């Protein structure tokens, strides 16, 4: 299952690093 | 079409308890993150709550005005919404609607991780009446 | 606490006409900001999403604009399936006591 939340979570991943 | 049939509802006394139900087709619901709206009679617009998918937690968050006595469940087994309430109060009484809700991630890089939230689908709502 | 000051709370207006309803933001909340539609005996229905975007098949004379504390939605062409009740609705936050504005009613002038 992919949707807009999963984006979200990998996008704040990748600014925390 | 998306269709969401809400049943439940009626006459409740004050104190009392009831569950909404909310009979969810016409997309993936497990995919999906669905909330509750009310509206007092000849009043405007609450926001009751929502809950996630069962792989992000199944977490559910509330309005301020109901936290206390409100939980949303969900069954994706068979694609059904629950609102679940408690100590019922008169002014509890309205309209209740369900809601299929989507969201959009903000792009602005010092707001990756936020998300704007919106209630893109309602269903028709269900009556409650807190009244002694 | 956010607080959403929508008005008026009643606005006149003719077949053909451009309205503009406005909300006003207690505090800076960007672009996470609603609009939504109730027509009379009907449930609500998404208009705009993030200050201006149109959710799909949503009429194009529907607009809306604002970023911080002050938003407008306008209708540029009015017709008779817009009179109706318009809420807006931020989405900043999930704490504030009342996320909508207490709506507007467009009505037919005279």
């Known amino acids: 299952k992919w949707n807009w939340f999963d984006i979200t979570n990998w996008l704040w991943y990748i600014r925390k690093k | 079409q998306v269709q969401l049939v809400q049943s439940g509802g009626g006459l409740v006394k004050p104190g009392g308890s009831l569950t909404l139900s909310c009979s969810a087709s016409?997309?993936?619901?497990?995919?999906?993150?669905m909330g509750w709206v009310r509206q007092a009679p000849g009043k405007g617009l609450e926001w009751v709550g929502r809950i996630r998918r069962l792989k992000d937690g199944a977490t559910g968050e509330y309005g301020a005005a109901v936290k206390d006595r409100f939980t949303i469940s969900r069954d994706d087994s068979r694609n059904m919404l629950y609102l679940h309430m408690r100590t019922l109060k008169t002014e509890d009484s309205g309209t209740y609607y369900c809601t299929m809700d989507e969201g959009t991630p903000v792009t602005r890089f010092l707001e990756w991780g936020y998300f704007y939230y919106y209630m893109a689908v309602w269903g028709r709502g269900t009556t409650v009446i807190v009244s002694s | 606490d956010i607080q959403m000051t929508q008005s008026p709370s009643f606005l006149y207006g003719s077949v053909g006409d451009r309205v503009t309803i406005t909300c006003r933001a207690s505090q800076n909340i960007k672009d996470y900001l609603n609009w939504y539609q109730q027509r009379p005996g009907r449930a609500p229905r998404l208009l705009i999403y993030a200050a201006s975007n149109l959710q799909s098949g949503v009429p194009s004379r529907f607009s809306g604009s604002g970023y911080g504390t002050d938003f407008t939605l306008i209708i540029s062409s009015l017709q008779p399936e817009d009179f109706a009740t318009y809420f807006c609705?931020?989405?900043?936050?999930?704490?504030?006591?009342?996320?909508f504005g207490l709506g507007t009613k467009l009505e037919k002038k005279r």
């Open positions: 609705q931020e989405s900043y936050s999930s704490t504030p006591t009342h996320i």
């Open positions: 016409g997309f993936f619901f497990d995919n999906s993150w």
